[PDB]
Amino acid sequence: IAKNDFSDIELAAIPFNTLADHYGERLAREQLALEHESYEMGEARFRKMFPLITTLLPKMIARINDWFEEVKAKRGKRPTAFQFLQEIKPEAVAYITIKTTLACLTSADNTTVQAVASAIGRAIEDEARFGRIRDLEAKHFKKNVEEQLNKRVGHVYKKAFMQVVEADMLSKGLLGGEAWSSWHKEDSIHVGVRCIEMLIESTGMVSLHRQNAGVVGQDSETIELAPEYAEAIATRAGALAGISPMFQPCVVPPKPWTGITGGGYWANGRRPLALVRTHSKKALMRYEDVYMPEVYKAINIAQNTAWKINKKVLAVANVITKWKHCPVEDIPAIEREELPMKPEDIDMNPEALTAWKRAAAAVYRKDKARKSRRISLEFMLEQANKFANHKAIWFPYNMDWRGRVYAVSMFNPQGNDMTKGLLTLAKGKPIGKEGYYWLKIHGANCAGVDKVPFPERIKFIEENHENIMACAKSPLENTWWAEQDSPFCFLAFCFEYAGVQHHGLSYNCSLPLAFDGSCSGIQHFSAMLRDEVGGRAVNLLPSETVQDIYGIVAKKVNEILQADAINGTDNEVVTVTDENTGEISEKVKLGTKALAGQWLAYGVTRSVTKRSVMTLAYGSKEFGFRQQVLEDTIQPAIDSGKGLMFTQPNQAAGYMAKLIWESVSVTVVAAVEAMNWLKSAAKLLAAEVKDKKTGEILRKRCAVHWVTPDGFPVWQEYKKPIQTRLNLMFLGQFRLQPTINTNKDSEIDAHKQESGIAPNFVHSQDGSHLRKTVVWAHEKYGIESFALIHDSFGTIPADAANLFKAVRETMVDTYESCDVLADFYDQFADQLHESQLDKMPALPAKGNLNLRDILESDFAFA
DNA sequence: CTTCCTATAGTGAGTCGTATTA
DNA sequence: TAATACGACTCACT
Ligand SMILES: Nc1nc2c(ncn2[C@@H]2O[C@H](COP(=O)(O)OP(=O)(O)OP(=O)(O)O)C[C@H]2O)c(=O)[nH]1
Ligand SMILES: Nc1nc2c(ncn2[C@@H]2O[C@H](COP(=O)(O)OP(=O)(O)OP(=O)(O)O)C[C@H]2O)c(=O)[nH]1
Ligand SMILES: [Mg+2]
Ligand SMILES: [Mg+2]
């Protein structure tokens, strides 16, 4: 390991020496400096900005040590937070916070004082340790190198995109150790809060508020950034200038993996990376000794995927985002969102002010979301304008306990349209014909044209030619590209399809082409049992037409809608003539007879029968569809004036769900049956056992354990947290008692462990198929670039073909020699359950559909 | 039971009883 | 001595 081997005096030397060694030197320094950028503000970097962080940063810095006095002078006990806040350079303590705080804020969802603090406290610890190493490394990567100019130049402009090396030369000094927080979540809270606390005193940046008090279930405290700053983030460009996510790209090939920790970043002065983001220590420790070469090589290749900033897009990106009315509504405007003032009168509770409590909160619920999506945008935009030039930039990868592959950089190619459109590769090659074709294809996919045969897609392109004959020239005028489902990503194409015609099929192209199936997981299910209609629905079959699984269930459910629209039942009795009004909720259970008549009045298309579908891969039944169909289509409908027919909503919601669950239950029959099967295994395999009365017991609730195709092990270990609260006199005002979970539990939550065993095993696959994919595709068709998004594996226009094919070749080959369902069993037959065994088997019946029919499946790429 | 994972996480004022320090 | 900062416990919560 790193430590125990050499004294910290040099642990910060090896990384730099080795770095400067390959690649270059100029780029070597900027690297660890960059990595450092996620801990403390550059003394020089700062003096260079001569606008926003500039103001907040110092005010905070001061307050930090300034607070250390107030505490040092006082007698009595000292605020715990302090106890470990002192031995830490304040110039960092402040910086972390701002960012880390601004970071969390970018989450329109969880902004609860819990999260932030977690996020802050973590970093602080991430600096508490690696203290000197984080510093001494600087004094080191500061001094020049050992002579040499030529080879020290950095790359000699040699356009060859330097490739990383191997564990060989890799000095044992560059590894990883305990990448898990050593502090107790309890204390980690004291720190952040206190940080936050002092961030408030110093800078008013963000304020804390009591969200929906007295609400025993939805009661919590969150921090909402102050307007001032918010306002100077939509207008004042580069506002977050010096602000950079605690994780940024790299302008050099990343440090290859070979262990549970020790990858992505080089700088041994920071926090190590976890190959598998495990919600625990032990879980990750299991992954130590695995002997799973296929897993590593896979990620190693993905990580070594060089990226370039789409200089053209950016050019317009940061431009329009500052327009009062941007052609992209997906962009949080800069204008202020008013609201319907008090409804004429004042003291009334009919349906006006009664519903006003929910007719006015929309703005109080949206002003919070906008600021989110905006703070986010400004982030991706800074990094862009930041690396805009950088020759090449890599993204480090990680994977959840399930396998799925995530990029570590917050500015990952796995983000929104803006973000993706602003990315591209570099090792491109003269697209040629094969590519040009798919290029025009990718244009359509993005153009929202994914419901038709390729021939009709390409057609779509040639048809809208002149539509681009000016879009790529003066987009600032050609507001057409900003209409397609993904304008940004589309534009990127508009800029290629334009030049490809200015240079010919010789026109090199680095733009990655995206390939996404019809409905992942559901595709894999129909693959491990061969659901005849299943694959045919998830387009997995060599169909001649685009089978919209979502749309089939529409007409399908629509069919049953006409049924109950003729007979069904009838408006059941109210709830009047009774004893003493025991239950007056809904004085009419209505009937399926009039229900269909309401739906047929709304339309019911693929829309409604959408979410409820995919979600099925996560565990969505008729119970769940109620809420979905409601808030997704019913609830909002009426909250817009329409939906004037839905007299009793909740009921109608129970109606469609009903219809829905049916329509699919018989379609993707394999999926459900499979899940129910899985969902059945866990239970009697998760819940402990006892004995013939008395009380004695034997088998202890074993943690889910099985192995993926490529070899990636995995455990569910869905333990049950043991929470508690703290007492914190926040800002000498009140007492903030945080309810937090203790990262030292041991108990396990069966229930969940159950409802999750199935839906997880899914991704585990469609996330494992992927690895094998890229690997095979690497050695098979010598591929290097991969713009994969869990199920959207992409590559250069020329590597399209090999990819488009390779995916199948794996999906098949894999679910062929391998038997997920079966294998899983063998993974516990004896290891897990002992006696009984029975009243649980009932293997799922297989279907007749040779997987080779996939190698030719035109659609359903994934 | 009732929508996976990029992890999470009911709140604050009363009232006390302890180590801990200037 | 006498002043801190807080875990522990317990209610009522629009
Ligand atoms: N694992 C996972 N991936 C998701 C989920 N939602 C979307 N994705 C994938 O990540 C991609 C981008 O996700 P986000 O950046 O989180 O959402 P978004 O698509 O930008 O939505 P919006 O434009 O309205 O901001 C799109 C898709 O490939 C999700 O819940 N889980
Ligand atoms: N794990 C997970 N993945 C999601 C979730 N929502 C979306 N995704 C992933 O991101 C993908 C985005 O799909 P959409 O573009 O929203 O729909 P679609 O099914 O592709 O069909 P279409 O574009 O024609 O409407 C689908 C899926 O693989 C989610 O809640 N959880
Ligand atoms: Mg979203
Ligand atoms: Mg998809």
PDB file of C-alpha atoms in Angstrom, chain A residues 43 131 217 266 369 434 443 768 820 839:
ATOM      1  CA  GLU A  43      -2.800  31.634  -4.259  1.00  0.00           C
ATOM      2  CA  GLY A 131      -2.945  17.103   5.035  1.00  0.00           C
ATOM      3  CA  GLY A 217     -43.219  13.000   7.316  1.00  0.00           C
ATOM      4  CA  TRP A 266      -2.845  10.382  -9.908  1.00  0.00           C
ATOM      5  CA  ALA A 369     -36.092  24.215  -9.160  1.00  0.00           C
ATOM      6  CA  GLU A 434     -20.652   4.049 -43.762  1.00  0.00           C
ATOM      7  CA  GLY A 443     -29.172  13.423 -36.471  1.00  0.00           C
ATOM      8  CA  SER A 768     -22.509  -5.963 -17.311  1.00  0.00           C
ATOM      9  CA  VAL A 820     -28.498 -15.709 -15.208  1.00  0.00           C
ATOM     10  CA  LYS A 839     -42.284 -23.694  -1.777  1.00  0.00           C
TER      11      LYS A 839
END
